[PDB]
Structure formats: structure tokens, C-alpha cells
Design a protein around this ligand. Sequence first.
Ligand SMILES: [Co+2]
Ligand SMILES: [Co+2]
Ligand SMILES: [Co+2]
Ligand SMILES: [Co+2]
Lengths: 329, 329
Amino acid sequence: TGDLINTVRGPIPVSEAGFTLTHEHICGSSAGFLRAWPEFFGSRKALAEKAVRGLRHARSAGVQTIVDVSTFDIGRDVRLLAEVSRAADVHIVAATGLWFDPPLSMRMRSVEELTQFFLREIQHGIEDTGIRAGIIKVATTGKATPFQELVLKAAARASLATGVPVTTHTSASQRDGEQQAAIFESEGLSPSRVCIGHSDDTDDLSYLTGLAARGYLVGLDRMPFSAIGLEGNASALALFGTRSWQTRALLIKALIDRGYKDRILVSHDWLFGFSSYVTNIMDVMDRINPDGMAFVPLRVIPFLREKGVPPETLAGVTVANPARFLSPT
Amino acid sequence: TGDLINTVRGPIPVSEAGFTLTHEHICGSSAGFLRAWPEFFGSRKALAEKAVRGLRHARSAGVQTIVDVSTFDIGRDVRLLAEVSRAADVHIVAATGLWFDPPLSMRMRSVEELTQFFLREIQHGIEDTGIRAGIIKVATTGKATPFQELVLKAAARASLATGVPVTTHTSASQRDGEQQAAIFESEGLSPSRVCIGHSDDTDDLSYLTGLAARGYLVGLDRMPFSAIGLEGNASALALFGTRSWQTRALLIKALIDRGYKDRILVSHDWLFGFSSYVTNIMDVMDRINPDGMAFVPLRVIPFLREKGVPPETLAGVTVANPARFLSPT
Ligand SMILES: [Co+2]
Ligand SMILES: [Co+2]
Ligand SMILES: [Co+2]
Ligand SMILES: [Co+2]
């Protein structure tokens, strides 16, 4: 009791986070896009209603909290998050940071300037809303660009000043986590404040256990993503991969079997609208996974239980790990 | 009489546009940036007050209308435009289109989809404001990227459907106007609906008269830009160039002397905030040109008169040409 996390509806006790999905999105978009072209998603109203239905379904499956890791450049709309959070009765933690699509007004900034931006969103509020970010999202896609080095350093500095955790996008197959870890540590950030995400996009357990041994959280956060059965759809193939959800889920068991149960975070990287990729990618995704953000509790957790993972361990991963991670420290 | 142009304060008669600067900005930024980080500009209030002072000064010098060619990806804020337009009593024509910093949500779009977006902003309104664009801004920086080819085609289609003109950013030294012209003509767009901009960034009159002979408007729109005296400032050097304003202004006379007075549009490409480049570039610019958007009427027009250009010709360039260009056709 006593520790607090900021959500889009205000502060909540850490102990009320409960079953938490730590890498999710209401909408994958771009800054200003939902405002300028809402008809892309049918309408803003259609998008919100779809998100409320999806979050209610996740709620019914036992999900109490999601962390929406949409940054500024993912077109995070904190009013949308608040509306759908309220309607579905699911907590949503908003993010600051920058993903891999920053515009020039961000790309021209120094580490100091980026630190001030991230601190604004954490300490003051996002835009004019007073809604505070509870996490900092960063990204590389292979070796960090010079700008990305600054973003990661600014993320570490903002984390150190606020206790708010950092979570990352990687190209898992390129083992980005190792360089991200080196940059974060160069700023004196504790590995326990860091989740190396999209880590289930690889089966390289040497890479994954290397990180977990150093105290990093390992985000196995793309559980439902697979283009098996869709190999003729080139865009779906490129984004989803050819590994099954069971193959992804097996990595959760693999880490637990190797002593790293306390270092795992599990999620879907799901969304209810998606404008930053090919048109109608949302229809493809909805066909593959109509369960949306209930997929983890309905499919993954029972798979693991049937493979012999004890319920206390499963509770530790889905409840205790996100609580420790999100609790500002 | 009778013909109308849309401004941020609503429709105005074409004949009331008067002395018009056809390539200008209130603020050079990025989508969502002013909303998320207004302190970058001191505050939104500081930015608006600065813009009102600048536009009042341009007004006192005889400027009646500016065309703000800020697109979505330049972080156009149509409420800001309306506020400052109203306070300074200067008409402002807003833009649709895309510049050279589109986010992924735009970059993944087809020509058809981009056409619908541009048509929304022209025919329905920008965001939820009902403010309609009166011009379509596009950009290349050398040879068009595949995406830029789509943007230019979508611009032509939107122009053909609405009569609204198209205006371009070029890398003038690379003669981008020739390819832009070829793409526009491939869509059956009339050259009289097109301004090839930043054309005063080059002294290649073979290139410029080539375009003017085909019926294109030639935008000599960076009049005050020079890093002469600043050669030690690398960023200012790269963006401003080493040619004097008088050298730029001489191109207006050169085109008039070659029979092309009706094909010239003159502007500054000025702004009152600038986040898409190096920090404090606005301070450098304000030192070079404290006259801001009054520079053309105070310095350029008298220079031309003293070089023998008749007042009727100068009136034709600054009043009749923008009227014909902006009048939907
Ligand atoms: Co990602
Ligand atoms: Co994501
Ligand atoms: Co330009
Ligand atoms: Co411009």
C-alpha cells in the first residue's frame, strides 16, 4: 500500500493495478493524425467504441490495467485514452518518450531539450490536459541512430529524476537490447527500471538470458503475432513473422525454467486502430486474433499452466512484475 | 468582383486580397508539436503576440494577405492562424498538402487516399474547425521519392477537383521544378495552377525562364535569406545561402525584363517560430531581418523601382498575380 502510479484518470494505488499488460496501444498512429483525418478510422467515435468493446473483453478475461506505450510520434491521444479507460473501466497508463518516427522538431533537439520534454509529460502533464505519463517509451531498429542515442540518454535522465520506468522497441533479431543496455548504464540507470521490448520476436535465449542476468525486464510483448496461414500477404508476413503464438509463449516458460520469472513482462502489442502501416492491416489482425487484448489471459496463461507453470508463478509475472516495474523507484 | 478565396476567418472577395505574400508561415514546426511542447516557443501566448506584432508591421508596410503554406507536417495550427489573423487584421490563407517531413501514417497512403485527405481539408475543413485550405503545398528535395510522386499526383487531382492552386518546395539548385512540372502535367494539371517555389535560391535563368515559358508561376519567395556576415555559423550558412537579398531581388527584374512579369510571385518564407531546425535559429533570423514580412514592401519594392521597374508592373506582381493564382479556376 501507499505507492502510486499515474493513469489517464489520475493516480491509483500500485496494488490496484492488478493483472497488467505492459506494452499495448489504443491506436498506432502519428502525431496530429487522428485530429486531422479521423475518417481514416471510420470516425473517432467508431474508434473509441471499438476500443471500449476490446477493453471490456480484456477486462472480462481478468485484465485490470494496460500500459499504452504510444508516444507523441505514435500519435498518442491522451483524451481518447481517458474516454475509453472510463467507459471500459480498465486503467490506462500513458507514455512519454519517442518511438522511431520523430518529426524534425524532435530530431533537431539536444539531450537536454529532450529531457525537458520527457519531464514535462511526466511531471506537468501531456499537452494541456494535466494527464501525466507513467512510463518512457524509446526505440531502435538495429544500431541506434545518433538521434536515438540522445533519446535513450534523455529517457535515462528523465527516469532517474522521476523514478518512472523505461521501455523499449527493439529489432530483436539484431539484439538491439545490448546496445540499449550499454547506453542506459552509461547514464547510471538501474537495469530494474528498464524493459527491453519485442524480445519474443527472437528465440535467441543467449541474448535474452544475458539481459535478464543483468537485471533487465524482458518484454515478451507480441504474443498473438503470427502470419502462419497468411504467407501470401507480404505486409502481414513482414510485420507478424512466421513463428506461432505457442512458440512465443514457450519463451515465457524458457525464462522461468532458467530462474528468471521475476524478469518477465508479457503483453500483446495490440491496438484498435493502426494508421502507421498498410491500409486494412487492422482487418487482418482482427481476423488472426479476435480476442484482442484478452488473448494473453484466455490462451497464453492456460497454455503455460498446462505446461506445468504454477499459478503463483503466473500471478508473479502478470501482477507482481508490472507492479514493481511501474512503481516509481 | 464575385470570385472568392477561403481564409482562416472565412471567405473573402479575391479583389480584397490586395498586396499578397504567397509563401509565408506563422510557425515552422511539426504536427502536434505546438500542442505537446508550447514552452519550446516560450509559450503559445508569446508566439501569438510575436506573430501579431510581425503581421501588424507587414500590414503598416501595405501587406493585406499572406498565404501560410504550412501543411499538416509543418505543424500548421489553424486556430493559431485565425487568432493572429484577427488580431493583426491581415488575411491568412491556409494550406493543405504535405511537405518533406510526413510521418508514417501519411507515408503509407496511396494516391487515392492522399487525394481524399487533401479534398477533406479544402472542401470540409481542417481538423474539426471548418477552416478550409485555399492552397495545396507539396515538396521535393532533389529527385522525388516514390512517396513524393504520389503526393504531387494527389495534389494535381485535388486541384483539378476544386480549382485551388498548388505550390511547391524545391531544391532549386537541383532544378526540381522540371520533374515536378512533368508529374503535374502527367495528371493534366494546368501550369497556371502551379507555383514552383524557392526559385530565387538559384540564378539559373535557363531553368527559370524554361518554367515561365510553360506557364508556371515562379516563386521568388526567400527574399531576405542570406548568411553574408554569418559565414562562421554553419547552420545559418546551410539554410540561408551566401547570395545577397539584392541578388535574389535581381531575379524579379530579370524575369520581368524577359517578358515574364505575369509569371512571378514574390515572398519571404518568413515565420515567427521555427522548431523544425536548430534551436535559436529564430534569433539569428530576427537579427538578419528585423523587418520580418515587411521586408519585401520596404526593401525589395523600392530597390526594383530604383532599378526602373514601373509601379504598374510592381502592382501586377504583388497584387494581380496572387489574385489570379489564388482565385479557384
Ligand atoms: Co514496437
Ligand atoms: Co508497440
Ligand atoms: Co520550403
Ligand atoms: Co516555407
